[PDB]
Design a protein around this ligand. Structure first.
Ligand SMILES: [Ca+2]
Ligand SMILES: [Ca+2]
Ligand SMILES: [Ca+2]
Ligand code: NA
Ligand code: NA
Ligand code: NA
Ligand SMILES: [Zn+2]
Lengths: 417, 152
């Protein structure tokens, strides 16, 4: 009837969420408001060196949702070592960049490999976002709140985002180099010359942490995003129909489940530790009060049940177990365990494979350019060929014509033969 | 006439170039002597939001007054009962990215009267044909137009 939480580590520094990479390392990555990302081994050890240090690039501030917002490891992180983070920087800017772990230290990202995807303008520091996450199709989702930006604002001010209050969806897996991301054909505004192709659906305002069901009971639905928006607080959810090529944005489904009060956020439990929780929505408030939501294959109604046991956010390890980040420089991480089961059921076990240095062909021999998440080596200006080894000439060489040194062809005579 | 596409601009260059609206002169404040080059616009066939109540949305350079009044005719002609609406004109401080042509009365943020965004693209085209030296489908909420200075 009643759940229990156990401390994993204290002394944290303004934690906002915890997630995993999915590479067998079972490391627990802890996002910190200020702009840090700490690593935590399964056994419970913490790393001396941050996995991501960008407290200079990110503007924190206490009160104010500015700072480190979200992070999302690329599904094939084990191969390409790609990751995507969002944060505020300079009112300010909500930025979404792609980083790449160093090919020498699997426990620290190379800051040189930074690659900006989205830069969103912001006027206030509330209703920001900026939850990042991947879907079953591998596409990247970006939940952005309205950021207190009114219609009048977007109508009498130049240079405003136009993505605020909407759910964005872009394909990072591209064999293209002229762009950071491509728009999925499935998107409502793919091939659209009247609306932003990044926008899948809009209507959000002040969305807390939105719960994500990756295996919806509904056969015709491949993914569902449930958000607890406090705007008069309701709760809207995003339906992503299986095998549907949207030709226009879907409407966020609006319903009022939660009894009464503001909510930090929620999540779906896909763990092994608990059976009486598997598939349940779990939303909690900053006071420590939790609840569980569940629907029905028929009638499609909802029921709210109290969850017996300040909140800053939730986490989840590579094994599905959920965590609770609670409260300067004193944040704590709590793991949720079901008393009706051992702390580690034999079926929940999984040998630990420590993170290893990238080996992919691209990351192995790709010079003068970066690697796309699909293992392609995009060439920087002045290079060509599979891995950008074939020198570029300007003017290019005519009669072969092997270019070597800076714009110095190798014939015939002359600069270009 | 094929309406401009989202985030598209004509000419396909930066706003402050010789081919476009031209280089930035400076910030034309009220106490600035150059202010008197900005005369109010009282075209009955134009709706000014003037959310500032200052009527700064009407102040604009002669060339802008010409292009605008010429655009206001296309609008009424294109969609009956639908006039040209101006949300922003000449500004007297922060509200646009510095170096903006709104500070000079050379820029205008416009929409239709019915706010129906489905024509915001066609409006941008009618602006290009109206003479505006640079029309930009800025956001889904409005299009941005600008002209050159008397220095052309
Ligand atoms: Ca938030
Ligand atoms: Ca105005
Ligand atoms: Ca103004
Ligand atoms: Na489509
Ligand atoms: Na399903
Ligand atoms: Na190539
Ligand atoms: Zn403007």
């Amino acid at each position: 009837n009643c759940f229990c939480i156990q401390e994993v580590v204290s002394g944290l520094r303004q934690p906002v969420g915890a997630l995993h990479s999915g590479d067998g390392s079972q490391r627990l990555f802890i996002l910190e408001k200020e702009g840090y990302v700490k690593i935590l081994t399964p056994e419970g050890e913490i790393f001396k060196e941050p996995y991501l240090d960008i407290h200079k690039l990110v503007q924190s501030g206490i009160k104010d949702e500015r700072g480190l917002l979200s992070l999302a490891f690329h599904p094939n992180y084990k191969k390409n070592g790609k990751l995507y983070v969002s944060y505020t920087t300079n009112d300010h800017i909500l930025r979404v960049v792609e980083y790449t772990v160093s090919r020498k230290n699997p426990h620290q990202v190379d800051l040189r490999t930074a690659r900006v995807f989205l830069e969103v303008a912001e006027l206030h520091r509330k209703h920001l976002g900026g939850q990042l996450l991947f879907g079953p199709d591998g596409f990247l989702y970006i939940i952005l709140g309205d950021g207190m930006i009114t219609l009048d604002d977007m109508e009498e001010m130049d240079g405003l985002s136009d993505f605020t209050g909407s759910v964005l969806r872009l394909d990072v897996d591209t064999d293209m180099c002229n762009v950071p991301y491509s728009i999925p054909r499935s998107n409502p505004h793919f091939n659209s010359t009247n609306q932003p192709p990044e926008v899948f659906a809009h209507g959000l305002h002040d969305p807390g942490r939105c719960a994500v069901d990756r295996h919806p009971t509904d056969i015709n639905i491949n993914l569902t995003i449930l958000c607890s928006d406090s705007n008069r607080s309701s709760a809207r959810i995003l339906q992503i129909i299986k095998g549907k090529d949207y030709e226009s944005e879907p409407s966020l489904l609006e319903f009022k489940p939660f009894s009464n009060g503001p909510l930090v956020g929620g999540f779906v439990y896909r763990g092994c530790q608990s059976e009486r929780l598997y598939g349940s929505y779990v939303f909690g408030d900053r006071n420590g009060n939790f609840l569980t939501l569940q629907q029905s294959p028929v009638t499609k109604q909802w029921q709210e049940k109290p969850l017996c046991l300040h909140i800053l956010g939730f986490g989840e390890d590579e094994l599905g177990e959920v965590y609770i980040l609670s409260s300067t420089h004193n944040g704590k991480l709590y793991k949720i365990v079901d008393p009706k089961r051992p702390l580690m059921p034999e079926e929940c076990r999984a040998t630990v494979q420590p993170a290893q240095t990238l080996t992919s062909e691209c990351s192995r021999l790709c010079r003068n350019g970066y690697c796309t998440p699909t293992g392609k080596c995009c060439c920087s200006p002045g290079w060509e060929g599979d891995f950008c080894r074939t020198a570029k000439c300007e003017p290019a060489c005519r009669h072969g014509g092997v270019c070597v040194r800076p714009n110095k062809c190798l014939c015939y005579l002359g600069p270009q033969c | 006439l094929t309406p401009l596409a989202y985030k598209q601009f004509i000419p396909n260059v930066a706003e402050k170039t010789l081919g476009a609206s031209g280089r930035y002169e400076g910030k034309i404040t009220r106490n600035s002597e150059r202010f008197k080059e900005l005369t109010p616009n009282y075209n009955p066939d134009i709706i000014f939001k003037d959310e500032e109540n200052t009527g700064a949305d009407r102040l604009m350079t002669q060339r802008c007054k010409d292009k605008l009044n010429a655009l206001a005719i296309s609008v009424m002609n294109q969609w009956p009962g639908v006039k040209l609406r101006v949300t922003e004109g000449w500004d007297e401080d922060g509200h646009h990215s510095e170096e903006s042509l709104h500070y000079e009365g050379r820029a205008v943020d416009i929409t239709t009267s019915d706010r129906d965004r489905s024509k915001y693209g066609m409006l941008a085209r009618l602006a290009v044909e109206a003479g505006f030296d640079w029309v930009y489908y800025e956001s889904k909420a409005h299009i941005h137009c600008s002209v050159k200075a008397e220095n052309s």
